[PDB]
Nucleic acid binder design. Sequence first.
DNA 1: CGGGTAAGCAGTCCGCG
DNA 2: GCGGACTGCTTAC
Length: 900
Amino acid sequence: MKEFYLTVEQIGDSIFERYIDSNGRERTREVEYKPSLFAHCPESQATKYFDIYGKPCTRKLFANMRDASQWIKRMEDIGLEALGMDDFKLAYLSDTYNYEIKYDHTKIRVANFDIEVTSPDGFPEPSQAKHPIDAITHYDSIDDRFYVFDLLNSPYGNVEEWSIEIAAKLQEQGGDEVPSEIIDKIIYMPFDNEKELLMEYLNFWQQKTPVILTGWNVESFAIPYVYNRIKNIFGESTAKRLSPHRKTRVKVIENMYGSREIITLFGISVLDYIDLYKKFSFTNQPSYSLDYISEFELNVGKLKYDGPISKLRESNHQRYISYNIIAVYRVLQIDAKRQFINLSLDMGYYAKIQIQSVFSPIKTWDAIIFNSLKEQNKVIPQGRSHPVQPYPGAFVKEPIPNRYKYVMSFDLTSAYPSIIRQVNISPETIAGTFKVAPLHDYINAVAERPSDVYSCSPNGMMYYKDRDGVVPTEITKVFNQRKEHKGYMLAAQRNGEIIKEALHNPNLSVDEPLDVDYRFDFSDEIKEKIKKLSAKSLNEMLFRAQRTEVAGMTAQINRKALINGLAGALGNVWFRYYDLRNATAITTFGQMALQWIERKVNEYLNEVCGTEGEAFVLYGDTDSIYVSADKIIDKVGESKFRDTNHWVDFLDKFARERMEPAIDRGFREMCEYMNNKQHLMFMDREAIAGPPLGSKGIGGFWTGKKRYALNVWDMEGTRYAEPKLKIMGLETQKSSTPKAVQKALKECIRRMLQEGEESLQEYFKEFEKEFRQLNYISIASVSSANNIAKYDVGGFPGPKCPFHIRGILTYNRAIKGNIDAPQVVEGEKVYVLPLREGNPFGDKCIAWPSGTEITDLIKDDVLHWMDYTVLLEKTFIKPLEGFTSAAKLDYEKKASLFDM
DNA sequence: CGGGTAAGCAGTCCGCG
DNA sequence: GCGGACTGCTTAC
Ligand SMILES: Nc1ccn([C@H]2C[C@H](O)[C@@H](COP(=O)(O)OP(=O)(O)OP(=O)(O)O)O2)c(=O)n1
Ligand SMILES: [Ca+2]
Ligand SMILES: [Ca+2]
Ligand SMILES: [Ca+2]
Ligand SMILES: [Ca+2]
Ligand SMILES: [Ca+2]
Ligand SMILES: [Ca+2]
C-alpha cells in the first residue's frame, strides 16, 4: 500500500512524523528537513521557478528550518518579499507525499475518551486539577475495546468494584442498561489508588497512542484536566508523556471577551467532538450537553440518577462507572450516524494538512492551492498585512408581505463557486479594470459592454480568458466531489419517500429488510418487493435509508461549506490570497445575476400570460427567485386537476420544460454580456408549493426579508408522501424560541397553509387555554450569555443590562452562598423565564444553565412565580400576530351578523 | 479559535409637545 | 406606545 502520514510536527530543526509505512505498520521518524524558500531574481537568470504572476524566482535551500525563519525576518527588515510555504511542515508533507493520498482508516488509531472527577466545592477547574481523577473510559478504534480505569479508593469515598453483570441488566432490574452490543468489548481495570491508575493509563497510552483524539469537551476539559493532574502528582515530564514526542504547550484561546487555556499535545490530532458537531452539523442547539445532543441525534433518553453528580460516586458507584462508559459510546453512536471523523480524514488528507486544521478553511485552502501550484513549479506569494475593511455582499429583494398561494422557487447551483468558475476569478488571473456603470445599468442591459477581450464582473474587474486560474481549478475539484455526494444524498431521500408510501399498506408477514444500496434510486424489482414487505422490515429500511441520507448530507454539505469558504477567504485578511477586488467581484456579480434573471423571468412570464408590468417574481435572496404560479394554475383551471399531485406534476413539468430553458437563455446572454470564460449559471427548480387541492389552506406567506413559510410538495425532485413545511427565519426556526412554542407556532403555520383560517382559530383558542400546563423547560426562552461581568454591578444590573443577563444576575443572587449550585458559564447558553411582580427573587426574570433542571433550592419558587401571561404574549402571540397580519387573516374569530 | 455579508427581532434608553 | 439609536443575538444565504 501507499504510505500516508498520521501526524506531523515541527520541533526546532526537526520534523517529527508519525506515519503508516508501505506494509501497514505505524512508524515514527525524525527528519532534519531542509526547507526551501524563494526570492525574485533577474530575467537573464536560468530558472524553473516562477511566482504566480510569471516573474522568475531563485530557490534558496536552507541548512535548517530556523535559518529559513530568520531569513524571512531579514527579508522584511530589507523590505523584500520572501516567497514560498513558510509553514515548513506543510512543505514537508508536500515533498514526502507527492501523490493523491490513499488512506486506510482501519490503520488510524482513533481514541474516544471521557474522565470522571468528583468535586464537593463546585466545578473542577482543569487548570487547577485539585481533585482525584476517579474514572477513565478510553475507547480504542483499532482494538475496538472500551478500557475502563476505575478508582476504588479516594479521599471522597472508598467503593466496591463495578459489576459488568449489573451493568448489562435492564433499568427495571436495578441495572444500568449498558447496551449489550458493547458488553463484550469492555476491559475493566479497578485501581487501589490514583497514582497507580494514572501510571497505568500512561503506560497504556504509550502502547496505544492516539492519532485522532476525540470525545466530548475533551479539548477544554478532559485533556487539560488529565495533563494538569498528572503534572501536579508526578511533575511535568511525566505529564508530557501524553505527547509521543514529549512536547506540549499551553495554548491561550482568545475570544472577543476573554480567554481560556488548552494543552497542545505535539504528535496528536485532537478533534473535540463538540467542535466537530458545531462546525459540521448545521444545527444551532439550545444546549450542547452530551445528554441533550444524544437525545436529539439518537433519540436515546437522558442518563438519569438521584442527587448531585458530586455525590453520585459515593451513593452509586455502579451507575457512576456505567454512565462514564455509556457517555463514551454515545459519541461513537453520534459519529456512526454523522460521520464527522470520516469527513475530517477525507478533507485533511485531500488538503495535505494536519487533520485538526480541517477546522480552518484558510489553512485548508492555503495547502490545496500551495500543492496545486507546487506541481507546476510555481511559487506562492508571501502573506501580507491588511487592515480589516467592510465590503458588500448579496442582494435581497423586499417582498410584499402577503399570503402567496402557488409558488415555484429556483436557485443557482453552488452560486459563488460557479461565479468564480464562470468569471475566472483568481489572484493571478486579474487582467485590469473597466469603467463601471451603476449596477442597475448592467441589470437592465443598457450599460456599455465591459470588455471585448477579458471576462468581467460588474464591480469593474477583468480576468484572463486564455487559461483557468488556480482558484477556479481547485474549487472545481471539490465542487465535483460535492455534486457526487449530493447525488447519493438525494437518491437516499427519494428512496425514503418510496418506503414511507409503501408503509401505508404493510403486509402481514414475517420477512427481512432488503439488502440494497440506498445511494442509488430503487429499481423496479426492489420497488415491487418493498410493496410486499411487513411494517417491521419497512421501518428498518426507512431507518437505513435515512442513515444513508444523513451520510450523504454530511459529505455534501460540508464540501459546499468548504468551497463557499474559499469565496469568503478572499475577504479575510489572514488569507494568503486576500483581495477585496476578487471578494467583491464575486458578490457584485451575484447581485447582478439575481436581478438580471428576475427581469428575464418576468418578461418571459408576462409574455406567456399576454400581460405587461406584472411582477411574477415576488422574492429572492442572494441567488434564488420565488415565482408566483397562480396565473399558471388558473390558465388551466383548478377544476381540471384530479388531485394535488396532478397540479404538482403540471408545475414540475412547466418548470422543467418552459421556465428552466427560459432561465438558461437569459443567463447565456448575461455570460456573453460579461464576456465570461464559461456559462456556469445553472438555476434549477427548488420548490413547488401550494395548498392541498380543494382545501382552504393559503399555501404560503412572507412577512419580510428572510421570513417566510411554504407548503412544499416537491423539493429538488423529491416528491413527498406528505407535504412538508419549508419555513425560513420565523420563530419556529430559532433556537432562542421555547421548544413548546416552536412546536405550537409550527402547527399554526401548518394549519394556515394546509387548512385555512378556521382551523387556525380552532388551534389557537385551545393552545391559549392549555399552555399553562406545559413543563417550565419547554416554555423557557434560550439565549447565549456573553459579558456577564460587564453588566454585573455588585450583583445587580448595570446600565443597558440585557434581559437574559438580568436573569442570570437574578439567578446568581438566589444561589449566593452555595458553591454546590451550578454556575452559569460565561459564553454558554441559558434558559430564561419571566417572573410575576412581587416575586421573592426581586426582579423580572431568571436564567439558569440550559439543558438542565434549575436547582431544587429555587425550582419550587420559579414554578410558582413564572409569568405565563408575559411568556405567552412575547413568544407566541407576538410572532403569530406577525404571521397572520402578513397572511391577512385572524387568529381569533371576528364578530359577525350570524351571532344574532 | 476556526471563510464572508444581509437582515431580522428583543430589549434598553429616551425622545416625542 | 412607538420609533430610532444602539447592543445582543440569531438567522438566511
Ligand atoms: N454559509 C454560507 C451560505 C451561503 N453563502 C453564499 C455562497 C452561496 O453560494 C450563496 C447561496 O447559498 P446557497 O445556500 O444557495 O448555497 P449554494 O448555492 O452554494 O449551493 P446549492 O447548490 O446547495 O444551492 O450564498 C455563504 O457565503 N456562506
Ligand atoms: Ca460525566
Ligand atoms: Ca444555491
Ligand atoms: Ca439546486
Ligand atoms: Ca404492501
Ligand atoms: Ca439559495
Ligand atoms: Ca424595536
